[PDB]
Design a protein around this nucleic acid. Structure first.
Lengths: 812, 832
RNA sequence: CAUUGGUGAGCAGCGAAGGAUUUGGUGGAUUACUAGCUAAUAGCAAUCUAUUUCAAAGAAUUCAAACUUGGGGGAAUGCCUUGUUGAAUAUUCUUCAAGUGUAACCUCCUCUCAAAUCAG
């Protein structure tokens, strides 16, 4: 599964996933630790700048997050990470095979619960020490004591008392001893969320009904209750700032704010997080500040504040409703199409089924900003066509961007789902621009690309028409008609001279762009699904339905290379920065890497996930994959720009003492070799038990015995050996010895020597064969000589080529 | 033909920051304005890294072994560079202004002097892949009161001491269990302790301060700890130290004084070796090797570097560049020569690979403006605002004849006929095209007809007719031969400058004030076609600009245009950050190039950061020179409205990002432009980026890679061993199916070695086809490296074409002989 | 007549449970992200105070020290310098002159312009 050329760097574009994040303080200030699958992230709260990421991807997904002052405790499958600064300082692997559900930190202890209804206790090795490493014990919750463990909290001023809450009830333990010091009675509802309190003794519980219970332990009594009509609570928090305020987070996305003194709700926030992705997953007031940080399952993390109260005379009664503050968002759905936006590998466009663009910044995670979808006021004056309930733009299938004239007009073209046109966007203004570009033959836009002069956007219909709109005024230039099937990939050359298109007809059309003539029309076998062009080197690649990427030269007007080798539908594929390579990914869960001068798969990555989009950076450094699950963008470091790796054709097989070495005689049988020892024997020769052994090789019709002493025969004795050949009528020993030579060239070893013996035959019996020319016996064996002989012009094609190249390369 | 990448920056030999040699005394690291140049002293070559920094560099070091390069800005941008690989590994941001980075002599961990903070980080690993956050802060020591100005390790890694502008000079260890062994501080000086040191024995401590003092600290008695055994004063009267180094194994102090003086001492003795006046200008940085026989100074008053020996009275290089004063640039017909002119008068002669001013000519007294080559790159000329055109040859390196006018008039631009008599000059004052004979110093003709200045001139390579550019928006083409003395105007409608002809001499590129380049016919009068540049020019908004760059008219024309050596492309460059590559017949630009990405350079940024736009004023436009610790840096000499005048400090501004002169190489289509930063080189000589392979090896490792099928890497692990049994093991071990896969991926480092191994072994070998596939794959693979360096493979390729003809083509001639005898004897008939 | 002027009516035309404009506030980017504070190897972050203090280490131009002054004059009264005089005990201080001496201290300049108006 390991790649040699690339390696995982980070999954760019993720803020959170829905796993309940933790809050911590450094001194006076706050950090936030969220989860993204197998990798957690740390933020300043005062700017939502990214602070740390995990040093390693965890082998399974993180289930729980707690955070003390300098130490963030992650909890995946059986093991719990004690992390300083995102680096694995101490892994605590629990002595079950049960999965870690929840976790808490107090005192010299750590306490983490599993799904076997049993909590594990981990002492510090000393109170002098800071992180807990000593394993203390495991205590359990049997089904007379409680239900499934929903949370472990420690309410303050409770000496070694552990508060384990279930769906049923609440338990308290002395974790020095291991004794259940108190069991609460069952609450009749299914308890779903716990939270400690800035008042003493109180745990807040939000159940599966819309009910929050403040619960004492010194009383053991449920002191107050709070109702919610028809909502399932997910998170509870307390504003410890200076007025007693309570935060109720639903799984419907809604955030409800109470003042328990006025016994009244203050404001309910609606839809700060997406309901389908978990609602509000976790909201928490920053302790002693009027700032609540909310986190949803829509890859989003928002901040809200209470403004200080407008009523000078009252204060606490008149409350400003909570107000939007800074937020880091991501694509809620996985991203459908990505591209590398700029030249210096700073920005990446990522569009999802969330129906939005995002302009991620691989430099700094906070310059990642979601693009606007706000239409410019239409330059015509008559009003535009759309619902007044303004929905997002439909999800995108193609992207197109050239930064040549950026910010003087639009330069991003996006092919939305099932729309007859495609909108234009300014990359600089982070907003959809003024022009929308149609098909004008009533088909869908299925592929787009733009001109490198920044003046043209090319738009390919599902009925074959390619419109050339201008990025100046939104005007069209030409509407080409070549395909009667769908177009599926367009390009222009880097000089804006000759334009290509690939279609679902099996046609790649060569047109000029300055001129208006169809120059060429290459017919390929399957219909052609996509087209990638390399402007610097004027090639263009295409995926087809034949599971194979054909790289087509635009000059020589023919195929230069075809990479067979995939096993499924080729999803995305990309050239190198310099045209040396192509990265391809298909539905076969392979991401193969290709050296196009030769054409061999020099590495293929096997992934657990299917890789939907691959995007090589224009710089030689980064590779971007997007998967089918997962919302971020896996960034891959390219090791070739750093040292190198091996380039072998090793994919299908998966998918000394004496400091001396004798030479191998023949590496493979197909190659030609010479006689071991002197090369001068050709220069000598060119400037009976024998015939009995030749007969006994002839009666076998394999003469491999003769060639042995034929090499080993002394060169002057051969001048009588061939000069006694016993052939007047039958021409047997002529044909015996000639077929001996042709069988000699068959194993290709001592290749020169059988040519020397052939010329020595011409020295000996060229007249004996010549005056009996047309005789079909010797003519058959010389036809066999030519059939064996005709392959080895491949060294004459090697010698002349290599010689001329050597001279041409030394002189010039 | 399109793809041009940055190769090398030339000159402006020091601006700001620390200078260091490597482990070996070959590699010298200097900062440039925002880049790092490396000068290799014995193997005389120069190099500047592919990347640039975002502000001026104020801190620099390289690794112990030469693997990692740390450059740090004024602000604290830190850039991790694979030093052997010239690729950037990590951009970290230190949020404080740091002054010293020093690696361990271990190489295991480096440390940083930022503020009163010392930050000690582990080194990132080079052979490991690049990670998100490679850096691990080991410890942070904040026991200091003011900004920490100097810092050193011991020769063991286990002891690090730093010194501040606070009086203190404090030692700690790396590891805290080595705290109790030695953790104390030094005080008792007078001033800024500017450098504190360990001796080569780790028992003597030298502490040097700004006032002119050294203490010799020693762990000695009246338990007992750390007294001064002696002091040392050089008694510099009003002058004080700026920079100090100490080479411990020979016990040598290098000092840099404010008066430009410098001293050498022998520290258990404190004996003055020699005092050198480096100049009026102070030594801003000192440096020694581990051998300690070269010294390196940099004056940031002038912008000069100086490698000089302490023991022998002998320099290595005394390089003195001139910022903002790179006026002309000139490729020779040979692709080995480059000429840079100046406003100071110096005209330097560079090799492109070995970036050294081989020659200079310091004989012009004023600005030298335009330089063209002629007659196979023999003669090279220099028109000036010095009132002359002085000729120069490249064999004797001498002035030939200073062509003069009557009234001693300045000359704007220069044009030379290949027939080396005719040299025309246009003037910025006099606006009459003066023609000088090369043999006769008299003027041949005073071409009149320019109303306002003659901007630029060129001759054809074909008909050698000249085209001058008025400021009367009008080209004047002059045909002075055939005894006609005939003229033709070409009316343009807007104000032209920076003329440039096709080598065919029938079409001309013109730059108007609109930015629009026009192409004019010369056999006819009309305009051919015009390409637009006012849209696709990256211009910058200055911090003192009061208008945005989208509607700024600062730099949206072109101050130089050049045709390609087909005449089918054009590189133009102006007062902008943007260099442009238009195609001539297709008439659309191919690629747009940044010259420099520097905040301290003024017109770099398109959009200014609104956090710096304060209530009244910029945040940077406030005079911050008045808070310097030094009196000289607090002194303001800036006359108000000086635009491209004499010195840097007297603009009272940031330097504008401007590129003056633009030329193509003939051969490899490489273009060089002399910028504000200096001469930049773009080229098509791609994969000259040096690439070490398989960095730390047994014979078993390559042979296990044969068992591991890692055959190209096994060839590398064999070729690092250089035993021919291993090369014939690993040579015949790989299959044919990955021979050109291997050979295209072979570096150029072992390229004469592999070509010689093929050229020698294949002569006596039966594997003629198998060797032949290797030479086919290599010569088709990297024949371009043998296209440049022919004398590098001349011994290997000789053996190779010995094997091709005498060993292989003899077998081929045997084959074709038997073939043609077969064709004759089966195609012909008999008798009787 | 062109109005290529807009008002003004209108209409064709565009057109999903409004359209068009104008602005306040705040947040986000506007350089490439390693956490806050402190006395900093550590402690803090509910706290450093009734271990913060002992200890060590720690003092040259024997007084180098306006690299900084708009330009001329002078520079009375000051100062500086040596010449020169007295006193005290090899040095300060009293007294005194000579200084195209002097960033103290006195004056002259460092304002009056093809800018405009106005009589002729």
């Amino acid at each position: 599964k390991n790649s040699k050329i690339f390696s995982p760097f980070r999954i760019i574009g993720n803020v959170s996933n829905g796993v309940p994040f933790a809050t911590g303080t450094l001194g006076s200030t706050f950090y936030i630790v969220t989860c993204v699958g197998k990798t957690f992230q740390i933020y300043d709260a005062n700017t939502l700048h990214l602070l740390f990421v995990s040093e390693k991807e965890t082998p399974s997904s993180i289930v729980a997050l707690s955070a003390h002052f300098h130490y963030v405790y992650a909890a995946y499958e059986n093991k719990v990470g004690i992390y300083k600064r995102g680096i694995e300082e101490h892994l605590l692997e629990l002595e079950t095979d049960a999965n870690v559900e929840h976790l808490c930190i107090f005192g010299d202890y750590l306490c983490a619960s599993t799904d076997d209804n049993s909590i594990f206790i981990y002492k510090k090795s000393d109170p002098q020490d800071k992180y807990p490493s000593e394993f203390y014990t495991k205590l359990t919750v049997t089904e007379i004591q409680g239900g499934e463990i929903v949370s472990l909290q420690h309410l303050a001023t409770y000496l070694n008392k552990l508060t384990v809450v279930t769906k049923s009830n609440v338990l308290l333990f002395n974790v020095r001893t291991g004794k259940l010091v108190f069991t609460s009675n069952e609450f009749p509802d299914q308890i779903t969320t716990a939270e400690p309190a800035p008042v003493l003794d109180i745990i807040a519980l939000g159940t599966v009904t819309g009910e929050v219970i403040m619960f004492n332990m010194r009383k053991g009594k449920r002191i107050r209750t709070i109702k919610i009509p028809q909502s399932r609570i997910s998170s509870l928090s307390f504003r410890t700032d200076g007025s007693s305020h309570l935060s109720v987070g639903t799984s419907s996305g809604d955030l409800i704010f109470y003042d328990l003194d006025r016994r009244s709700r203050i404001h309910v926030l609606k839809n700060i997080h997406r309901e389908s992705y978990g609602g509000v997953t976790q909201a928490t007031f920053l302790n002693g500040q009027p700032i609540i940080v909310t986190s949803g399952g829509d890859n989003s993390l928002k901040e809200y504040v209470f403004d200080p109260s407008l009523s000078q005379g009252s204060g606490d009664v008149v409350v400003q409703p909570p107000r939007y503050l800074r937020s880091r968002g991501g694509h809620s759905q996985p991203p459908s199409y990505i591209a590398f936006a700029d030249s210096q590998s700073h920005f990446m466009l990522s569009a999802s089924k969330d129906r939005s663009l995002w302009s991620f910044s691989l430099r700094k995670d906070a310059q990642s900003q979601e693009m606007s979808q706000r239409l410019h006021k239409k330059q015509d004056g008559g009003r535009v066509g759309g619902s007044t309930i303004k929905s997002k733009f439909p999800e995108i299938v193609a992207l197109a961007i050239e930064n040549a004239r950026i910010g003087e007009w639009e330069n991003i073209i996006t092919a939305h789902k099932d729309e007859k046109f495609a909108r234009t966007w300014d990359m600089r203004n982070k907003r959809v621009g003024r022009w929308t570009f149609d098909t004008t033959d009533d088909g869908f836009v299925k592929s787009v690309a733009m001109s490198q002069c920044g003046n043209f956007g090319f738009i390919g219909s599902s009925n074959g028409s390619i419109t050339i709109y201008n990025m100046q005024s939104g005007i069209l230039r030409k509407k080409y008609k070549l395909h009667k099937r769908a177009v599926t990939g367009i390009s222009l050359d880097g000089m804006n001279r000759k334009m290509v298109s690939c279609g679902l007809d099996g046609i790649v059309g060569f047109y000029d762009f300055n001129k208006s003539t169809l120059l060429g029309k290459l017919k390929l076998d399957a219909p052609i699904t996509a087209m990638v062009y390399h402007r610097s080197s004027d090639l263009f690649a295409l995926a087809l339905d034949d599971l194979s990427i054909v790289v087509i030269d635009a000059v020589t007007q023919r195929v230069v290379r075809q990479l067979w080798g995939h096993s499924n539908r080729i999803t995305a594929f990309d050239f190198s920065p310099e045209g040396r390579w192509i990265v391809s990914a298909s539905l076969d869960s392979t991401i193969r890497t290709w050296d196009l001068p030769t054409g061999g798969c020099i590495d293929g990555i096997i992934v657990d996930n299917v890789a939907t989009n691959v995007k090589f950076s224009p710089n030689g450094d980064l590779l971007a994959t997007t998967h089918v699950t997962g919302n971020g963008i896996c960034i891959w470091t390219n090791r070739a720009q750093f040292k190198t790796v091996s380039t072998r054709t090793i994919d299908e097989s998966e998918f000394i003492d004496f400091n001396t070495y004798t030479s191998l005689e023949q590496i493979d049988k197909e190659l030609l070799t010479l006689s071991i020892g002197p090369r001068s024997k050709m220069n000598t020769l060119l400037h009976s038990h024998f015939t009995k052994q030749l007969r006994e090789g002839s009666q076998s019709k394999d003469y491999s015995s003769l060639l042995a002493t034929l090499i080993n025969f002394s060169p002057a004795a051969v001048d009588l050996e061939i000069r006694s050949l016993n052939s007047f009528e039958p021409f047997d020993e002529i044909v015996w010895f000639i077929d001996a030579l042709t069988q000699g060239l068959k194993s290709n070893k001592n290749f020169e020597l059988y040519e020397t013996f052939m010329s020595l035959l011409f020295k000996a019996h060229g007249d004996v064969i010549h005056a009996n020319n047309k005789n079909q016996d010797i003519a058959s064996a010389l036809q066999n000589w030519e059939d064996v002989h005709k392959k080895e012009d491949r060294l004459d094609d090697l010698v002349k080529f290599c010689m001329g190249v050597a001279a041409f390369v030394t002189t010039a | 033909k399109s793809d041009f990448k940055f190769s090398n920056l030339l000159g402006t030999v020091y601006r700001q920051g620390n200078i260091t040699f490597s482990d070996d005394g070959k590699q010298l690291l200097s900062p440039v304005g925002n880049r790092v140049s490396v000068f290799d002293l014995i193997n005389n070559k120069s190099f500047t890294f592919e990347y640039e920094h975002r502000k001026n560099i104020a801190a620099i070091d390289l690794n112990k072994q030469g693997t990692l390069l740390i450059s740090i800005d004024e602000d604290g941008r830190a850039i991790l560079v694979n030093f052997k690989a010239r690729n950037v590994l990590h951009h970290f941001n230190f949020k404080e202004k740091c002054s010293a980075v020093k690696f361990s002599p271990d190489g295991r961990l480096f440390a940083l002097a930022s503020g009163r903070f010392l930050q000690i980080w582990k080194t990132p690993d080079v052979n490991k892949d690049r990670q998100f956050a490679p850096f691990v802060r080991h410890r942070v020591h904040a026991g200091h009161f003011q900004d920490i100005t100097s810092l050193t390790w011991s020769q063991d890694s286990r002891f690090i001491l730093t010194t501040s502008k606070d009086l203190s000079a404090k030692i700690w260890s790396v590891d805290s269990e080595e705290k109790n062994l030695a953790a104390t501080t030094f005080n008792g000086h007078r001033d800024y302790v500017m450098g504190a040191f360990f001796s080569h024995d780790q028992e003597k401590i030298y502490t040097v301060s700004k006032d002119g003092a050294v203490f010799v600290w020693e762990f000695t008695k009246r338990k007992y700890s750390w007294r001064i055994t002696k002091k040392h004063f050089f008694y510099a009267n009003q002058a004080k130290v700026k920079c100090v180094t100490f080479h411990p194994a020979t016990r040598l102090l290098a000092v840099g004084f404010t008066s430009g003086e410098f001293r050498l001492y022998d520290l258990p003795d404190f004996t003055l070796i020699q005092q050198l006046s480096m100049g009026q200008n102070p030594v801003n940085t000192v440096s020694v090797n581990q051998t300690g026989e070269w010294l390196a100074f940099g004056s940031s008053k002038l912008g000069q570097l100086l490698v000089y020996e302490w023991q022998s009275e002998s320099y290595i290089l005394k390089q003195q560049g001139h910022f903002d004063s790179t006026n002309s640039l000139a490729y020779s017909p040979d692709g080995s020569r480059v000429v840079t002119a100046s406003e100071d008068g110096k005209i330097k002669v560079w090799d492109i690979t070995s970036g050294f001013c081989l020659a200079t000519f310091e004989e012009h007294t004023s600005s030298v403006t335009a330089v063209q080559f002629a007659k196979r790159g023999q003669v090279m000329f220099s028109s000036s605002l010095d009132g002359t055109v002085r000729a120069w040859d490249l064999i004797r390196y001498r002035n030939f004849r200073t062509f003069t006018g009557t009234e001693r008039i300045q000359f704007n631009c220069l044009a030379v006929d290949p027939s080396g008599e005719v040299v025309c000059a246009g003037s910025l004052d006099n606006f009459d095209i003066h023609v000088w004979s090369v043999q006769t110093g008299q003027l041949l003709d005073a071409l009149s007809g320019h109303e306002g200045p003659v901007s630029c001139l060129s001759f054809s390579q074909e008909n050698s007719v000249l085209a001058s550019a008025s400021w009367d928006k009008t080209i004047r083409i002059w045909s002075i031969f055939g005894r006609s003395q005939q003229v033709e105007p070409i009316e343009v409608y807007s104000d032209v400058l920076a003329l440039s002809m096709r080598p065919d001499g029938k079409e001309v590129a013109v730059s108007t004030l609109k930015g629009q380049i026009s192409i004019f016919n010369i056999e006819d009068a009309k305009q051919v076609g015009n390409i637009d540049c006012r849209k696709d020019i990256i211009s910058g908004r200055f911090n003192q600009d009061r208008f945005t760059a989208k509607n700024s008219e600062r730099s949206k024309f072109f101050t130089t245009i050049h045709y390609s050596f087909d005449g089918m492309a054009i590189v133009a460059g102006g007062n902008n950050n943007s260099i442009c590559l238009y195609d001539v017949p297709n008439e659309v630009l191919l690629k747009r190039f940044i010259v420099s990405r520097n905040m301290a350079l003024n017109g770099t940024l398109e959009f200014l950061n609104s956090k710096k736009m304060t209530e009244a004023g910029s945040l940077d436009l406030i005079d911050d020179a008045g808070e310097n610790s030094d009196l000289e840096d607090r002194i303001d000499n800036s006359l108000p409205g000086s635009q491209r005048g004499g010195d840097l400090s007297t603009r009272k501004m940031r330097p504008e990002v401007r590129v003056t002169s633009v030329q193509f190489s003939p051969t490899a289509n490489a273009f060089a432009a002399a910028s504000t930063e200096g001469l930049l080189i773009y080229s098509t000589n791609d994969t000259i980026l040096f690439d070490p392979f398989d960095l730390d090896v047994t014979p078993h490792s390559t042979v296990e890679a044969l068992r591991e099928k890692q055959f190209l890497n096994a060839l590398v692990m064999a070729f690092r061993l250089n035993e021919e049994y291993l090369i014939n093991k690993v040579y015949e071990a790989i299959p044919i199916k990955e021979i050109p896969l291997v050979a295209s991926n072979i570096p150029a480092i072992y390229l004469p070695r592999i070509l010689k191994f093929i050229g020698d072994f294949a002569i006596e070998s039966q594997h003629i086809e198998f060797n032949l596939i290797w030479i086919k794959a290599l010569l088709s693979a990297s024949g371009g490296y043998i296209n440049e360096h022919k004398y590098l493979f001349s011994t290997a390729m000789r053996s190779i074409q010995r094997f091709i003809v005498r060993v292989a083509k003899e077998v081929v001639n045997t084959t074709t002989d038997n073939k043609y005898t077969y064709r004759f004897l089966v195609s012909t008939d008999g008798s009787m």
